[PDB]
């Protein structure tokens, strides 16, 4: 029927002066563009078909041709930057924005999907979509008393597209676009579908990634408790972006950080820190590191929640990248902690796993660890206990590792490791 045509046949049909022939030919193009094994996107582009498809977007009298073009353009825009750029150069942005208003939900949804792919290309197209005025009609599609009455695939596409309009960093989206979208995003974050929740968390994660002014506008909407609740979800696709967003927030001010603490976040961390998914452990440990970089009373909350043995555990055994984050969490904690906090850290068993790590071929971890040693010595000094500390480092084999590091081909390692022996060994 319209299955398996050549591109030259599709060209013949689209150039006929017959709307029905054009329709058949567009659907044929769509079915070519819908196969998983190498769809001939470049062949279609090379044939000159994009501008014709874009003009079919405007055929209100022909709803089926509007849909097949939408779908064909969707799949093209789904390709490389060059393929997406061809769609945009065809004038497809305003035309897809106009179709958001279609009375046909399947057509309106296809327009949403296409705009998602265009914004997903990066900063410039995201921003180009926003200048065309996509946001208002996108949001007007979600202006319903209850989200549950929308078709679910449709709601998912809206959510994902809005999330691509929040994404990317150099530059971040316009402040006023972010302000416009946030209220609706807060609503979607309370919706009960897992994909809608996952992609709402992704959007919040994009929006909390950067300067503290951007964190602020999110935290101000009061989403942190709902984030923390999602952080406890059983679905890994929801936990991953909820954790990234929580982690982005605690890179912010002490007050912003305190908000995730007040939300109950640290109660979820015994399991996040022992999560069998190695990426959740990494991210959770990085998160812990920025909380240990907080106030003393924030550090104290890490203590009260029983989290320091979990940090010992991760430093002891974890994929190397997680250990690296753990080393940071310790360096931070020892640099901002009370002496009593640091004594506590040592009582939990930090020394021996910290020393084992000095065998790592990774200049940066070594610096981070020597820094933590020095910080801990500085607390031992204040208590007349450096000798008691030197013995533990000695007994676990830490001196051999510090001694070996003097002749290290790195100016920072040599200085601080000779300095440690000078002062303590």
């Amino acid at each position: 029927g319209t299955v398996n045509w050549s591109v030259e046949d599709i060209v013949k049909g689209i150039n006929s002066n017959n709307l029905e022939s054009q329709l058949q030919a567009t659907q044929a193009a769509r079915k070519l563009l819908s196969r998983e094994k190498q769809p001939p996107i470049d062949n279609i582009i090379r044939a000159g078909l994009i501008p014709k498809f874009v003009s079919f977007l405007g055929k209100t009298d022909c709803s089926p041709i509007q849909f097949e073009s939408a779908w064909a353009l969707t799949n093209i825009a789904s390709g490389t930057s060059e393929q997406t750029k061809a769609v945009v150069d065809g004038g497809a942005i305003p035309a897809f924005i106009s179709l958001l208003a279609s009375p046909h939900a399947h057509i309106s949804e296809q327009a949403v999907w296409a705009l998602g792919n265009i914004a997903g290309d990066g900063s410039a197209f995201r921003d180009l979509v926003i200048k065309h005025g996509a946001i208002d009609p996108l949001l007007a599609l979600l202006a319903v008393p209850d989200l549950s009455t929308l078709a679910c695939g449709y709601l998912r596409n809206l959510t994902w597209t809005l999330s691509n309009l929040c994404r990317n960093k150099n530059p971040a989206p316009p402040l006023d676009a972010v302000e416009q979208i946030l209220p609706t995003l807060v609503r979607l974050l309370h919706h009960n579908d897992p994909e809608v929740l996952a992609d709402s968390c992704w959007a919040i994660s994009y929006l909390t990634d950067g300067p503290n002014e951007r964190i602020e506008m999110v935290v101000k909407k009061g989403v942190v408790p709902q984030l923390v609740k999602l952080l406890g979800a059983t679905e890994l696709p929801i936990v991953t972006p909820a954790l990234r967003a929580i982690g982005n927030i605690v890179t912010g001010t002490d007050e912003q950080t305190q908000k995730v603490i007040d939300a109950g976040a640290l109660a979820v961390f015994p399991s996040l820190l022992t999560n069998p998914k190695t990426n959740i452990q990494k991210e959770a440990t990085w998160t812990m590191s920025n909380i240990t970089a907080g106030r003393q009373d924030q550090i104290q909350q890490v203590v009260n929640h029983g989290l320091v043995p979990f940090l010992v555990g991760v430093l002891s055994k974890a994929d190397f990248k997680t250990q690296k984050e753990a080393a940071w969490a310790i360096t931070n904690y020892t640099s901002g902690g009370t002496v009593e906090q640091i004594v506590y850290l040592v009582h939990c068993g930090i020394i021996e796993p910290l020393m084992n790590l000095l065998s790592a071929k990774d200049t940066k971890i070594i610096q981070v660890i020597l820094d933590a040693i020095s910080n801990i010595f500085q607390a031992a000094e204040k208590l007349g206990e450096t000798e008691k500390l030197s013995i533990m480092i000695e007994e676990c084999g830490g001196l051999d590792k510090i001694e070996a590091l003097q002749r290290h081909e790195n100016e920072s390692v040599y200085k601080a490791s000779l300095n440690l022996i000078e002062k303590y060994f």
Binding site: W71, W113, G120, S205, T240, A293
Partner: peptide
């Protein structure tokens, strides 16, 4: 500020073909 802000980029699907 001991805060470290620049995580490994991560997201949902960037682009998506229909079927």
């Amino acid at each position: 500020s001991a805060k470290r802000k620049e995580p490994e980029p991560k997201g949902s699907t960037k682009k998506k073909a229909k079927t």
